[PDB]
């Protein structure tokens, strides 16, 4: 409708993390940017930086908070602000660790499945009610803490598929956007 949609991809900034599986909302954010023909600026006010457009005929304005990962809801909150959205029209794009890889689940509302970045955003918004489209990197294996997993790239095998699970993603959040 007339509401305002905010899009938020997680992510640690430095080209070092770029390809960390804490990274995917990154990469799907520059994906649907680069589909809407958007680009990123600086946004001194909540330190984060935004592209704006229109999907589905709604408004959209696009996000990769520049702050760490434990940090992105500070500059995730003054952004809803800024751009008057309300927690329930945010989508935040993110690795899951509960769903397996590769698999993709819209989900609005609920748990943070363990992630630092969710953690962060709830705290920040004071409500889990806001939207997330989740991508499967499935869960670590028994010799990696969950926290450092994320912090490591794919795989030789899973880094095959990445490219084409974050065109899937962007897709997935697309679809959301259009439906709700
Ligand atoms: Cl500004």
Same mark, same amino acid.
């Not at 007339?2 to 804490?22: I, K, M, Q």
């Not at 509302?109 to 889990?128: P, Q």
């Given at each position: 409708?007339a509401?305002?949609?905010?899009?938020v991809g997680l992510?640690?900034?430095?080209?070092?993390?770029?390809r960390?599986?804490h990274?995917?909302?990154?990469?799907?954010?520059d994906?649907?940017?680069?589909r809407?023909?958007?680009? %990123?600026?600086?946004?001194?006010?909540?330190?984060?930086?935004?592209?704006? *457009?229109r999907?589905?005929? !709604? +408004?959209? $304005?696009? =996000?990769?908070?520049?702050?760490?990962?434990?940090?992105?809801?500070?500059?995730?909150?003054?952004?809803?602000?800024?751009?008057?959205?309300a927690?329930?029209?945010?989508?935040?794009?993110?690795?899951?660790?509960d769903?397996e %890889?590769?698999?993709?689940?819209l989900?609005?509302?609920?748990?943070?499945? *363990?992630?630092?970045?969710? !953690? +962060?955003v $709830?705290? =920040?918004?004071g409500?889990?009610?806001?939207?997330?489209?989740?991508?499967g990197?499935?869960?670590?294996?028994?010799?990696?803490?969950p926290?450092?997993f994320?912090?490591?790239?794919?795989?030789?095998?899973?880094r095959?598929?990445v490219?084409?699970?974050?065109?899937?993603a962007?897709?997935?959040?697309?679809?959301?956007?259009e439906?709700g």
């Amino acid at each position: 409708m007339a509401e305002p949609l905010l899009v938020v991809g997680l992510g640690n900034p430095g080209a070092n993390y770029a390809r960390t599986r804490h990274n995917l909302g990154f990469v799907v954010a520059d994906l649907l940017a680069a589909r809407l023909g958007a680009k %990123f600026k600086a946004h001194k006010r909540s330190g984060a930086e935004v592209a704006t *457009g229109r999907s589905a005929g !709604r +408004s959209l $304005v696009l =996000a990769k908070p520049r702050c760490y990962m434990n940090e992105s809801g500070r500059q995730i909150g003054p952004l809803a602000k800024f751009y008057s959205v309300a927690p329930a029209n945010i989508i935040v794009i993110h690795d899951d660790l509960d769903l397996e %890889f590769g698999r993709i689940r819209l989900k609005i509302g609920g748990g943070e499945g *363990g992630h630092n970045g969710l !953690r +962060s955003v $709830v705290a =920040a918004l004071g409500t889990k009610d806001f939207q997330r489209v989740r991508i499967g990197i499935g869960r670590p294996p028994g010799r990696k803490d969950p926290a450092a997993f994320v912090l490591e790239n794919f795989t030789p095998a899973e880094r095959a598929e990445v490219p084409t699970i974050c065109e899937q993603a962007a897709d997935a959040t697309e679809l959301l956007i259009e439906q709700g």
